[PDB]
Scaffold this active site. Structure first.
Site, PDB file in Angstrom:
ATOM      1  CD  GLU C 210      -0.498  -8.710  11.516  1.00  0.00           C
ATOM      2  OE1 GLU C 210       0.049  -7.699  11.012  1.00  0.00           O
ATOM      3  OE2 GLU C 210      -1.558  -9.167  11.070  1.00  0.00           O
ATOM      4  CD  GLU C 288      -0.063   8.861   2.017  1.00  0.00           C
ATOM      5  OE1 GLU C 288       0.630   8.969   0.981  1.00  0.00           O
ATOM      6  OE2 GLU C 288      -1.167   9.422   2.115  1.00  0.00           O
TER       7      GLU C 288
HETATM    8  N1  LIG Z   1       3.795   5.149   1.416  1.00  0.00           N
HETATM    9  C1  LIG Z   1       4.524   4.984   2.527  1.00  0.00           C
HETATM   10  O1  LIG Z   1       4.916   6.040   3.378  1.00  0.00           O
HETATM   11  C2  LIG Z   1       4.978   3.624   2.933  1.00  0.00           C
HETATM   12  C3  LIG Z   1       5.953   3.525   3.950  1.00  0.00           C
HETATM   13  C4  LIG Z   1       6.321   2.273   4.482  1.00  0.00           C
HETATM   14  C5  LIG Z   1       5.715   1.137   3.974  1.00  0.00           C
HETATM   15  N2  LIG Z   1       4.777   1.260   2.959  1.00  0.00           N
HETATM   16  C6  LIG Z   1       4.194   0.048   2.395  1.00  0.00           C
HETATM   17  O2  LIG Z   1       4.058  -0.968   3.346  1.00  0.00           O
HETATM   18  C7  LIG Z   1       4.086  -2.234   2.675  1.00  0.00           C
HETATM   19  C8  LIG Z   1       4.817  -3.196   3.592  1.00  0.00           C
HETATM   20  O3  LIG Z   1       4.252  -3.055   4.883  1.00  0.00           O
HETATM   21  P1  LIG Z   1       3.305  -4.254   5.423  1.00  0.00           P
HETATM   22  O4  LIG Z   1       3.796  -5.505   4.734  1.00  0.00           O
HETATM   23  O5  LIG Z   1       3.169  -4.156   6.918  1.00  0.00           O
HETATM   24  O6  LIG Z   1       1.873  -3.954   4.720  1.00  0.00           O
HETATM   25  P2  LIG Z   1       0.460  -4.647   4.999  1.00  0.00           P
HETATM   26  O7  LIG Z   1      -0.517  -3.982   4.120  1.00  0.00           O
HETATM   27  O8  LIG Z   1       0.472  -6.105   4.855  1.00  0.00           O
HETATM   28  O9  LIG Z   1       0.091  -4.252   6.502  1.00  0.00           O
HETATM   29  C9  LIG Z   1       0.118  -2.948   7.008  1.00  0.00           C
HETATM   30  C10 LIG Z   1      -0.694  -2.965   8.310  1.00  0.00           C
HETATM   31  O10 LIG Z   1      -2.048  -3.232   7.968  1.00  0.00           O
HETATM   32  C11 LIG Z   1      -2.550  -4.322   8.724  1.00  0.00           C
HETATM   33  N3  LIG Z   1      -3.497  -5.030   7.878  1.00  0.00           N
HETATM   34  C12 LIG Z   1      -3.324  -6.102   7.016  1.00  0.00           C
HETATM   35  N4  LIG Z   1      -4.548  -6.376   6.471  1.00  0.00           N
HETATM   36  C13 LIG Z   1      -5.452  -5.454   6.937  1.00  0.00           C
HETATM   37  C14 LIG Z   1      -6.821  -5.218   6.732  1.00  0.00           C
HETATM   38  N5  LIG Z   1      -7.438  -5.722   5.678  1.00  0.00           N
HETATM   39  N6  LIG Z   1      -7.446  -4.177   7.416  1.00  0.00           N
HETATM   40  C15 LIG Z   1      -6.752  -3.383   8.311  1.00  0.00           C
HETATM   41  N7  LIG Z   1      -5.407  -3.616   8.495  1.00  0.00           N
HETATM   42  C16 LIG Z   1      -4.789  -4.622   7.830  1.00  0.00           C
HETATM   43  C17 LIG Z   1      -1.348  -5.159   9.127  1.00  0.00           C
HETATM   44  O11 LIG Z   1      -1.659  -5.938  10.261  1.00  0.00           O
HETATM   45  C18 LIG Z   1      -0.290  -4.062   9.295  1.00  0.00           C
HETATM   46  O12 LIG Z   1      -0.454  -3.538  10.574  1.00  0.00           O
HETATM   47  C19 LIG Z   1       4.785  -2.007   1.355  1.00  0.00           C
HETATM   48  O13 LIG Z   1       3.885  -2.057   0.293  1.00  0.00           O
HETATM   49  C20 LIG Z   1       5.252  -0.572   1.526  1.00  0.00           C
HETATM   50  O14 LIG Z   1       5.468   0.133   0.333  1.00  0.00           O
HETATM   51  C21 LIG Z   1       4.378   2.469   2.432  1.00  0.00           C
END
Ligand SMILES: NC(=O)c1ccc[n+]([C@@H]2O[C@H](COP(=O)([O-])OP(=O)(O)OC[C@H]3O[C@@H](n4cnc5c(N)ncnc54)[C@H](O)[C@@H]3O)[C@@H](O)[C@H]2O)c1
Ligand SMILES: NC(=O)c1ccc[n+]([C@@H]2O[C@H](COP(=O)([O-])OP(=O)(O)OC[C@H]3O[C@@H](n4cnc5c(N)ncnc54)[C@H](O)[C@@H]3O)[C@@H](O)[C@H]2O)c1
Ligand SMILES: NC(=O)c1ccc[n+]([C@@H]2O[C@H](COP(=O)([O-])OP(=O)(O)OC[C@H]3O[C@@H](n4cnc5c(N)ncnc54)[C@H](O)[C@@H]3O)[C@@H](O)[C@H]2O)c1
Ligand code: PRO
Ligand code: PRO
Ligand code: PRO
Ligand code: NA
Ligand code: NA
Ligand code: NA
EC number: 1.2.1.88
Lengths: 516, 516, 516
Positions: C210, C288
């Site tokens: 978003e 991930e």
């Molecule tokens: N392991 C990795 O390579 C890596 C890399 C970058 C970020 N991250 C993780 O990302 C997190 C931050 O990113 P974020 O805040 O966008 O995470 P988030 O989980 O809130 O969202 C990630 C994506 O999932 C979507 N989403 C949210 N709820 C969902 C649902 N229940 N079903 C399907 N999609 C859903 C969001 O709209 C967004 O597009 C941190 O925890 C970070 O560590 C991990």
């Protein structure tokens, strides 16, 4: 595609009762079919003509072994249209799919090998083991070319990278061409010349030798059953200087794959150099022609080994091999001991109908007999007749194992390809002169040295100028994959059959750059 | 032998003041040396004659760049003795020794590159960048073939083993051959056609184009300083239809390596197919002949990028390239926007003496000029003249960049190689029709597509039937190693220069078996 | 296909005046374009909706960077039809054709890289170098996966041959899947998760975070210009828990490629294990998720080098990285000297709007800010606050670099991913205890050791249980190809990005035997 590593098909010795029984049964089946007529094969179908070709048993030439249709100009044109129409989609087959088609044809051939060998016996007068080695070589060509073709698959070319660009070079097939084949290996050579070009996406019009039309038809039965798409392989039995010349000269024939006499090879290479009216390419012509092959023996050799090898090389298939030893060059110290041993061995060779598995069967035709007998008449003037030199009794074209001695190196019988069981023995002073005499012909196909002296063998490796050289063994029977086969000088264009290089002859290269 | 991995010689653009200074000095010194006389080079020594070849400056043909000796039959015979004699021992050099000799020749040419570029500017009317590309390409041939030759060294051939035997297959050079070269890349193609065959153990008699005999002598100065043994390389400036034909037809000439007009290449290839009296081999002949090369542009293309690559391709070295875009095939939605951009770019092109570094220098000779102007008059009755079409004022052979539009695909100017600054624009409906028109010529050398549509690019990759195809970039200037160079159809025999495959063309194979 | 060997895209540091000029112009143009509207992209066309997603500037959230269309169920259904239909023919493209399409997309992204960096600065509050690293990483994914995909091409699988049979095993793509991406690397991770699967023949429905919908539309502008066929790639900005969950749970979704919070990743992985009504396969799900990443420092370390890498690791992009050092574990002899140096460095960090290129911009949203500040209040009752801990003045979401010391290893702030500029310092006795505390979290993503002692480094290599471990350097900024990226434990499924293994995750294998 993943298959077992290539191995050569075992050549049947018929030392077992089972093998002898199996061959008797095939001979019987084959002769029960002597009445068959085999049409042309064009665009996936058997197509008959009004005129016909007749095939005789050279061991009993009042016996007809079969008849085929006879292709003229119109049938040559129909084969062309079918071959070019097939090329358009056959060229786009993945290589793995084409290679699998060949592997099927090989397995079908392997299952019909006694029948094929029995056809060679009756049709061209090969004894049992000669027939076996002919069919096994044919199988090898299919197996070997199926695998080799994958080495050329998209995109196979090694190129230098350039920044901001994809540079992709790859091979494509040439188109439709003509295969014109000899009577002397009418399964093996006929088969290799066709399936090599076909494996990599070319299409083929095959013109079998007049003396071997029946066995060539049976090869097409295998092709047909394997399921080559219509137009990909076409079978046009017919007269060489008619249908063959017409196709060689045609503006829409893309390539010519020829094995046969130097006389004809010279005409074909010349016609191929010309732009026919309307032609839009430079024709490729591969012409593998005769030899005047020599075995050298020096005073260090195992004389018994040499004599056996000489006799095998000179008289196997009645000397009707482009690889046959037709010259025996002996140094002063080797002269008497080897010659005495060669005469002893050769005088014990049997001659008669091929089906009884004699040492020698008949020469292939009345024409061959006439030609071999004329060379024997010439040789009586040029050298000393010491063995054979005569027609033998019977209707079959039986000619005795023949030896001339004291033959001058420049005599006609020391220079010209006789293509029968006639060995010319030349006496020389030493190894250097032996090499001089070996090199001094227009030809350069096979050669052999018997010697225990390492310096003589390694000297010959560098200076005995033939495409296929053998030390302390026979000079005939080059095995697919093991001994890439083909000569120098007037023995042809050095298209090495049974070798990775062979397929490249039937490909051209495209280089495509994309700047991103 | 271990050298750095191959990298292409950088092509000077003369943007730095240092490069300009070096080039001005080199031009000044070449100009100061006008009128110099260069003899033949035969059996390692410079040999003069009574007759001469005169080399004019096409920018000011009153000026004699230089003269050479002139080879007739006797000089051809002396060169043949020298080459065959050299061949006897040259063929036996280790490959590493021969490759080092090429590397030394490349280092020497690189040290002389401004002078050789300056010589091309004056002798054949190349501007500074075209001259720099030509010399860099010749350096690349030597560096590339030096390395590629090692891939073929004793014993290179992959064979199937056999119980109880050593089977060894290996390549040997063919002999002495003749190289016959064009004027349009008289450093690059002249060098490449020579050092390829020579790298792997052949010896060469080289016949430079009449218009480029001076820069050919200078390449030979490099060979002589490098230390090629007497006879390995021979320089025979002379009349193509006299001394060139004489060698092509000679029974002792083993191969012919030719680049030039289709008309000549047809004669050479026809003559090579004949057995001259006393000849003992089937001649090999590589003929790389012209093209009628098209760029296609569709409506998805970047029209500015296209217009620019078209102009470079059409007009670089005055359109005097086998690779030049002489056809611009525009789909309906591309027609107006591309033609406008091409006309706008082309009308800004400068034309003048080559030493001024104009966009275009002169065409090479009075005969080239006559021919180009004559085609322009033909074109006036076939399509619509929309730019140039005129001789420019001055003694040099200056022709304005010329465009014809609404050209019929079958017009003479859309079919025949004009080899001048003359672009034929063809309007078509769509990419399918673009491809038909592109393929429908006798030729198949270079081609180009500007398009962003992946399916059109990938379609062309498969079906735009040219040996050298380029997407979204100019279609001239193929780099050694990166883009194997050579065409299909009547653009020649597809001998791919600057590729591993090239050297195999000058080798034949021997198979040697020892049974232990 | 032959391209230059892979090299990582250089990360701009804006040290040259030329780079500064280019970046100022790019920022100015993006700023001038604020408020622009981007639709969905489905079956190759831009498709608008009635509802919208609003994208704010976290440096000044009164400013609308842009808006997008909003995908609900109907748009998810249209995208699914489009992806499956595309898949039918996309899976059959030659690998070379698909890889070239990636290469074209990389060239296009590289040409637009200043604009994409400028877009990240404004949309997610990256400073100039963080923005440059993100875009360079996305270029690297495309270049890398384009090449890596060729390693898997027909038929790639090594099998044991069997007599009389061809056995051919090969990879095929899975189908249409959904990609769901985070806001914190909205160019790199969004691109990599898309082009990986697509390279090898899958089709993708992509759901950007978003907070990063604008830069996601711009990546899609690149795909569209590159020419991916209709349906291969689809862009569905929308609410994760609405349209994202809908696709995760859908019976026709073949795979899910997810990067984000552990909380969401747990739900996705649980739902993927269920068979939705009518589903005909076992769903594949790569998740991930985050980390609680530590740097260990012992008393042998270079304390200045350590302090510097800790600060970069803890505070780069405001600590908003899955790879960020959120724990600093210091042995007793390292405690005072490292903490002092870290405090001294961190107190000099600038915080302000991202366009000013500060050390830290703002956190991404009001919700991120709330959460980080809330964790700061928790931390105040768990460890000792020694730096920052405050919201800064201004409308943007600015949080001061924060340090807590003497943190209990089991404190919430030492266990839970805060994802903000908040470092927890833990004091331990020795390297053994350092390792226990490092391993004792639910996570296993990144880790670091500063130490000169070889036995401690090599001990960590074996026993510091993280997927991505770094010695004597920062623990963020893993480079494509160099450091395969992905963790252990609740840091996810260990799908290693920028490695050959990644693409195998989106392929399944077929084994086809023909008995001849
Ligand atoms: N392991 C990795 O390579 C890596 C890399 C970058 C970020 N991250 C993780 O990302 C997190 C931050 O990113 P974020 O805040 O966008 O995470 P988030 O989980 O809130 O969202 C990630 C994506 O999932 C979507 N989403 C949210 N709820 C969902 C649902 N229940 N079903 C399907 N999609 C859903 C969001 O709209 C967004 O597009 C941190 O925890 C970070 O560590 C991990
Ligand atoms: N170099 C080799 O690999 C090798 C191998 C086997 C046989 N041969 C040679 O083959 C010869 C024996 O075979 P052959 O008697 O069938 O040879 P041949 O030259 O008489 O005929 C060979 C084939 O060419 C055809 N032919 C004849 N005249 C033709 C013409 N003018 N135009 C087109 N085609 C024409 C024949 O009909 C036949 O199909 C011997 O000289 C032998 O040395 C060479
Ligand atoms: N395919 C390629 O790589 C390529 C590259 C460059 C030039 N070319 C072709 O070269 C042509 C222009 O070069 P050119 O004008 O020097 O060509 P050309 O055919 O007139 O001459 C080429 C060479 O052949 C010699 N020659 C002429 N008549 C001969 C004869 N009958 N026998 C032997 N040699 C003869 C000439 O003296 C010259 O050395 C164009 O058609 C061009 O496309 C082709
Ligand atoms: O060497 C031989 O005798 C056979 C015939 C040519 C190929 N192999
Ligand atoms: O591509 C070109 O323009 C030149 C001509 C021969 C090869 N290099
Ligand atoms: O290592 C890092 O910091 C980023 C996050 C995903 C991979 N590259
Ligand atoms: Na017969
Ligand atoms: Na001149
Ligand atoms: Na935002």
């Amino acid at each position: 595609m993943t298959v077992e590593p290539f191995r050569n098909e075992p050549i049947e010795t018929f030392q077992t009762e089972e093998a002898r029984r199996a061959m008797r049964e095939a001979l019987r089946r084959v002769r029960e079919e002597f009445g068959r007529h085999y049409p042309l094969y064009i665009g996936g179908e058997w197509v008959d003509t009004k005129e016909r070709m007749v095939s005789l048993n050279p061991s009993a030439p009042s016996e007809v072994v079969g008849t085929t249709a006879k292709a003229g100009k119109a049938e040559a044109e129909a084969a062309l249209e079918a071959a070019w129409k097939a090329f358009k989609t056959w060229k786009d087959w993945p290589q793995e799919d084409r290679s699998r088609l060949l592997l099927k044809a090989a397995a079908l051939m392997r299952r019909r090998k006694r029948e094929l060998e029995a056809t060679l016996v009756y049709e061209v007068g090969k004894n049992w083991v000669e027939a076996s080695a002919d069919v096994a070589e044919a199988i090898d060509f299919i197996e070997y070319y199926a695998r080799a073709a994958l080495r050329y698959r998209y995109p196979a070319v090694e190129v230098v990278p350039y920044p901001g660009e994809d540079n992709e070079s790859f091979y494509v097939p040439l188109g439709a061409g003509v295969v014109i084949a000899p009577w002397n290996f009418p399964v093996a050579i006929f088969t290799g010349m066709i399936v090599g070009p076909v494996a990599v996406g070319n299409t083929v019009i095959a013109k079998p030798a007049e003396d071997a039309v029946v066995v060539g038809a049976k090869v097409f039965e295998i092709f047909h059953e394997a399921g080559f798409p219509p137009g990909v392989v076409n079978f046009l039995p017919g007269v060489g200087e008619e249908v063959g010349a017409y196709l060689v000269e045609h503006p829409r024939i893309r390539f010519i794959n020829f094995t046969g006499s130097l006389e004809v090879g010279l005409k074909i290479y010349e016609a191929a150099g010309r732009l026919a009216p309307g032609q839009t390419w430079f024709k490729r012509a591969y012409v593998e022609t005769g030899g005047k092959d020599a075995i050298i023996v020096d005073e260090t050799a195992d004389f018994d080994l040499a004599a056996e090898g000489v006799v095998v090389s000179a008289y196997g298939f009645q000397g009707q091999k482009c690889s046959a030893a037709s010259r025996l060059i002996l140094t002063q110290g080797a002269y008497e001991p080897v010659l005495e041993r060669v005469l002893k061995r050769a005088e014990r060779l049997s001659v008669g109908p091929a089906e009884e598995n004699p040492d020698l069967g008949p020469v292939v035709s009345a024409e061959q007999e006439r030609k071999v007998l004329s060379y024997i008449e010439i040789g009586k003037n040029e050298g000393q007749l010491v063995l054979g030199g005569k027609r033998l009794e019977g209707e079959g074209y039986f000619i005795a194992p023949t030896v001339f001695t004291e033959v001058p190196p420049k005599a006609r019988i020391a220079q010209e390809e006789i293509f029968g069981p006639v060995l010319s023995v030349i006496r020389v002073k030493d190894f250097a002169e032996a090499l001089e005499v070996a090199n001094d012909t227009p030809y350069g196909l096979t050669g052999g040295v018997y010697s225990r002296k390492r310096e003589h063998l390694e000297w010959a490796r560098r200076e005995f100028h033939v495409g296929n050289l053998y030390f302390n063994r026979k000079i005939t029977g080059a095995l697919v994959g093991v001994q890439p086969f083909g000569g120098f000088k007037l023995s042809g264009t050095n298209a090495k059959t049974g070798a990775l290089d062979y397929l490249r002859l039937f490909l051209e290269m495209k280089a495509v750059a994309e700047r991103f």
